Amino acid sequence: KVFGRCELAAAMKRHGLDNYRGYSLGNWVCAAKFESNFNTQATNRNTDGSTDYGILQINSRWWCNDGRTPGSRNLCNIPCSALLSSDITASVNCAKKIVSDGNGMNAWVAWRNRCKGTDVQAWIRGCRL
Ligand SMILES: CC(=O)N[C@@H]1[C@@H](O)[C@H](O[C@@H]2O[C@H](CO)[C@@H](O[C@@H]3O[C@H](CO)[C@@H](O[C@@H]4O[C@H](CO)[C@@H](O)[C@H](O)[C@H]4NC(C)=O)[C@H](O)[C@H]3NC(C)=O)[C@H](O)[C@H]2NC(C)=O)[C@@H](CO)O[C@H]1O
């Protein structure tokens, strides 16, 4: 699909992301334009061999099943292809706890620099929520 700015962010407040688990609601909407550029069909493999999956930019190496990742943990226990479709209604149970493991957003790379030390509080702005 193709989400407009105000139209692909209000979905986090329908999934318990507003002020969830130590991160504020706004801290989130920013990286989205920084991970797949508001699109769920944007994916790539890596120089390390782990294939990424969706707007979320996840690797088949530590989190899901693509089967081409042997010794892959897959603690999520759901097909990697289970997130990329237009419907993402079940797509966050993993990204939800990916931070509870104690290292936070560190899994995400772009935010640590692209959204870190920024006016992240300035992306979620301009939309009613
Ligand atoms: C734009 C782009 O291309 N970015 C891609 C990333 O989105 C993508 O994701 C990140 O992949 C890296 C590896 O390439 C991954 O790094 C490690 O992740 C694990 C598990 O989540 C972390 O877990 C820690 O484990 C240690 C023991 O190993 C524990 O003691 C600690 O308590 C754990 N803490 C956490 C975070 O739970 C590691 O900490 C982390 N590496 C380091 C240096 O600590 C990220 O987690 C990935 N994040 C996401 C969102 O998937 C990557 C994969 O293909 O590709 C990038 O290109």
| DSSP sequence for 2-40 | ---TTTSSGGGGTTT-TTBTTB-SHHHHHHHHHHTSS-S
Q: Is 112 in contact with 106 (CB distance < 8 Å)?
A: yes
**Is 87 marked active-site?**
no
* Pure H helices in 25-123: 26-35, 93-97, 110
**Is 48 marked active-site?**
no
Number of domains, the chain: 1
Within 8 A by CB and 6+ apart from 121, the residues are: 24, 26, 27
- Residue 122's domain comprises 1-129
Cα angle, residue 114 at apex, residues 110 and 25 outer, rounded to 5°: 85
For the purposes of burial, counting CB atoms within 10 Å of the CB of 34, is it exposed (0-12), middle (13-18) or buried (19 or more)?
Answer: middle
Ligand 1: residue whose CA is nearest its atom 21: 107
Pocket test for ligand 1, best of 23, 30, 59, 97 (most atoms within 8 A of CB): 59
Q: CB of 37 closer than 6 A to ligand 1? A: no
Cα(104)–Cα(67) distance, integer angstroms: 26
CA distances from 125 to 9, 111, 120 (A): 11, 18, 9
Cα of 116 vs centre of ligand 1, distance in Å, is 17
The resolution in Å comes to 3.2
CATH number at residue 81: 1.10.530.10
